[PDB]
């Protein structure tokens, strides 16, 4: 159980289009090129990175401009927006 933040700037729009469409499912598109991803077991991280390698081989550009950050339980607590709104807060029990 680990939270991650996924960010990139790949030069060609069509090459990074497949990056974006791959990464829609794993986490919400919180901003223009930033994703909030939740993982349970590192093997899913390994396979996601394997596919990212696949598309960057497809691009034939060797883009290392993909960056993953961690988001701990208290790192979330001091995280916010400019207007003070808390961000990246995951619910404990949804009573739908």
């Amino acid at each position: 159980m680990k939270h991650y933040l996924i960010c990139f700037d790949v030069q060609h729009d069509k090459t990074r289009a497949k990056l974006s469409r791959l990464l829609e499912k794993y986490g919400p598109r919180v901003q223009g090129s930033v994703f909030e991803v939740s993982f349970k077991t590192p093997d899913r991280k390994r396979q996601l990175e394997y596919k990212i390698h696949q598309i960057i081989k497809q691009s034939n550009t060797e883009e290392n401009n993909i960056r993953f950050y961690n988001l701990n339980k208290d790192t979330i607590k001091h995280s916010h927006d400019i207007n003070g709104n808390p961000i990246a807060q995951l619910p404990a029990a949804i009573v739908l």
Binding site: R46, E49, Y50, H53, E62
Partner: protein, 188 residues
């Protein structure tokens, strides 16, 4: 200087150097052609092929190999003839971001990233598991393997080149001098 220049190129990871990993990728007709060019036409070369392309018998199971591919491990001609034609892999190491630096009858392996190695290793492991399943279920008797001979005991007790798997079975190492992680108050 060559190591630091390669680090400047981007090759930030190194591997332990063993010629064994390159036994499963050798394409024999190129080797026979090179020997035929150097030593001349000879009746020994045919015999050499007949020593290198044989089939393993294990418990009434014939394990073959893909025609015109590979050098048998555990033979005396193989370590001599493997590094004789090692340079021919350079292009196939260039496309996948690998470099070899030679020195003092030895070499060293340099790579940008470690993802293709792990995918090749995971593909090989899955293939061996399916082969063991089809041994025990469908009663197959002639098994043709392309890769994975090092784990040939396991059966009984896109395509990536076969040396990638053998590299992926290993764990690599990396190569204003800062001195640790910042403290509560700051850096000194």
């Amino acid at each position: 200087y060559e190591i630091q220049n390669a680090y400047r190129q981007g090759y930030h990871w190194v591997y332990e150097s063993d010629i064994e990993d390159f036994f499963d990728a050798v394409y024999r007709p190129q080797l026979i052609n090179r020997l035929k060019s150097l030593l001349g036409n000879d009746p020994l070369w045919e015999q050499i092929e007949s020593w290198l392309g044989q089939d393993i018998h294990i418990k009434d199971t014939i394990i073959e190999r893909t025609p015109n591919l590979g050098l048998p491990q555990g033979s005396p001609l193989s370590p001599l003839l493997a590094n004789f034609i090692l340079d021919d892999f350079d292009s196939d190491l260039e496309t996948h971001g690998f470099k070899i630096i030679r020195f003092a009858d030895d070499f060293i392996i340099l790579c940008k990233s470690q993802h293709e190695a792990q995918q090749a290793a995971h593909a090989v492991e899955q293939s061996l598991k399916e082969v063991k399943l089809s041994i025990n279920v469908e009663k197959t008797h002639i098994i043709q393997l392309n890769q994975g001979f090092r784990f040939l005991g396991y059966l009984f007790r896109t395509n990536l080149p076969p040396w990638l798997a053998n590299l992926g079975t290993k764990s690599p190492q990396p190569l204003k001098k800062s001195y640790g992680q910042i403290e509560t108050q700051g850096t000194h």
